[PDB]
Amino acid sequence: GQETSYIEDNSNQNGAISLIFSLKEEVGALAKVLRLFEENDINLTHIESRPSRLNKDEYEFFTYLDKRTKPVLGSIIKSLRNDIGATVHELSRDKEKNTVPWFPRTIQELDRFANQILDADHPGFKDPVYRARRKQFADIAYNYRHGQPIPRVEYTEEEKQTWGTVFRTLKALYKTHACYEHNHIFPLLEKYCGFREDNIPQLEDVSQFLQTCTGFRLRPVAGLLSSRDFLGGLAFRVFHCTQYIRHGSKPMYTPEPDICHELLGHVPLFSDRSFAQFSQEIGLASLGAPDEYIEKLATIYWFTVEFGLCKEGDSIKAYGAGLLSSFGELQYCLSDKPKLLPLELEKTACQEYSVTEFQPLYYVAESFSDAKEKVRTFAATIPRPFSVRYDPYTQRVEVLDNT
């Protein structure tokens, strides 16, 4: 009711259904389970069995199925539960009765809904060339697949000039308004990723560098994804970021995120361990979270990763990416005009806001470490039949039952 940053998720044509369950290895168990699936008309390359990462005598099952297996899924869950004997969690993309809202278990699974994106006013609406250029970048995202190197695009001088206009202003403002963490990493991005005022950095280059710092990686997205999907990606330390640039007509404005917003507002901080851990915690807390809490986390995300203020000693600087890529509001947030409140997730989670520039209120975080722990705690209050944790080694979410 005030145009928020919370985008409710859809469902494709087939949607997505995944069954989470572990099976203790007892002679024939593995075969009975696969036989169970085999029997009910299900391709067994959609069922994956792996050793349990928690219990040395169990197998964990991953099922890449969709809505087309719905009819015989009830039977299978029943059998698994009653006959075979296994605690089963049904993850559904259409989050219905008794089903936990779907979420990727493996980083690769981020491919599933990555292409689930959402003009008249938009600068560039009457620009054929721009519209085509946007098609090009959208194509790259749509065609993108996890693991692949992000395709490089040669930016035109015009675009580079737009970049520079935004770059120049912000750089000449980070020292006095940006948090230590941002100002700490930026010089390196300039030195190593081609972050210059006469050059738009290639997403592949930035992704490599990010990984090298925090394991974070980039994924080119065509447009805005549902909060569930964007937040979810953070659990795998994956950042869905645009590659296109705003229209040159108004370099100082974007009614949507763009390469300028991702590279100068988000990327720098994702290179910091504490910050990386913080944002990932928000992603992990969203995994399978009910719509209500996704919006809450989306709101929380908004007042932290996007428009957050960090308290450094006796002063307050900005770390919110929405601030660090918007000179105007970047100066405004540190002025004496905005209302400031300490970060307190229960109140922040229900905070009323609008997407319009120049937020009237900002939340101040003690540190990234404090907020991370702050989110960990808020997460514990989110209705979920289990808890989650990321495994950097296998790049797979490990679902542990509530602690």
Coil, strand or helix: which one is 310? strand
CB-based contact 390:236 (threshold 8 Å):
yes
127 is in the binding site of which of a second copy, Fe ion, none (Cβ under 5 to 8 A by kind)?
none
Residue type at position 141: A
Q: Measured between alpha carbons, how far is 239 from 207 in angstroms, rounded to an integer?
A: 9
Residue 22 interacting with a second copy (CB under 8 A): no
SS3 229: helix
266 counts as catalytic = yes
Give the shortest CB-316-to-Fe ion separation in angstroms: 21
Between 214 and 286, CB nearer to a second copy: 214
Return the range that interacts with a second copy (CB under 8 A); candidates 130-138, 256-264, 266-274, 284-292.
Answer: 266-274
- Quick one: 177 or 240, whose CB is closer to Fe ion? 240
Q: Does 240 belong to an annotated binding site?
A: no
If the CB atoms of residues 103 and 186 are measured against a second copy, the closer one turns out to be 186
Closest distance to Fe ion from the beta carbon of 35 (Å): 36
User: Which of 159, 262, 306, 329 does the annotation list as catalytic?
Assistant: 306
Tell me which of 274, 332, 385, 389 binds a second copy, using CB under 8 A.
Answer: 274
Binding mask 313-352 for Fe ion (x = CB under 5 A): --------x-------------------------------
* Torsion sign across C-alpha atoms 126, 245, 362, 318: negative
Nearest distance in Å: CB 305, Fe ion = 7
Residues 6+ apart with CB under 8 A from 170: 264, 324, 325, 327, 330
> 266: annotated binding-site residue?
yes
Burial grade of 338 (CB within 10 A; 0-12, 13-18, 19 or more): middle
192 forms part of the interface with a second copy (CB under 8 A): yes
Regarding 151 and contact with a second copy (CB under 8 A), the answer is no
H/E element, 212: helix 203-214
339: helix, strand or coil: strand
From the list 92, 266, 281, 326, the catalytic residue is: 266
Choose, from 207, 227, 325, 326, the residue flagged as catalytic: 325
Comparing CA positions, the residue from 96, 97, 142 lying closest to residue 116 is 142
Task: Concatenate the DSSP letters of all residues of 51-63 into one string.
Answer: E-SS-TTEEEEEE
Q: Are strands 17-24 and 89-92 parallel, antiparallel or unpaired?
A: antiparallel
Nearest distance in Å: CB 365, Fe ion: 17
Does 26 contact a second copy by CB under 8 A?
Answer: no
- Told to judge if 247 belongs to the known catalytic residues of this protein, a careful annotator would answer no
Report the run of H or E that residue 348 belongs to, with start and end. helix 345-348
Chosen residue from 215, 223, 248, 338 binding a second copy by CB under 8 A: 215
Is 184 among the residues that bind a second copy (CB under 8 A)? yes
- 261 in a labelled binding site: yes
Active site annotation includes 48: no
Token reading at 128 = 């054929």
CB of 192 or CB of 386, closer to a second copy: 192
How far, in Å, CA of 316 to CA of 336, rounded?
12
Tokens of 317: 């600087």
Q: Which of 261, 295, 329, 387 is catalytic?
A: 261
Report how far residue 109's alpha carbon sits from residue 224's, in angstroms, rounded to the nearest whole number: 18
Residue whose CB is less far from Fe ion, 63 or 279: 279
CA-CA distance, 335 to 66, in Å (whole number)? 51
Catalytic residues: 261, 266, 306, 325
Binding-site entries for Fe cation:
261, 266, 306
- The binding site for a second copy (CB under 8 A) comprises 25, 30, 34, 48-51, 53, 56-57, 59, 106, 180-181, 184-185, 187-188, 191-192, 211-215, 237, 271-274, 276, 391-396
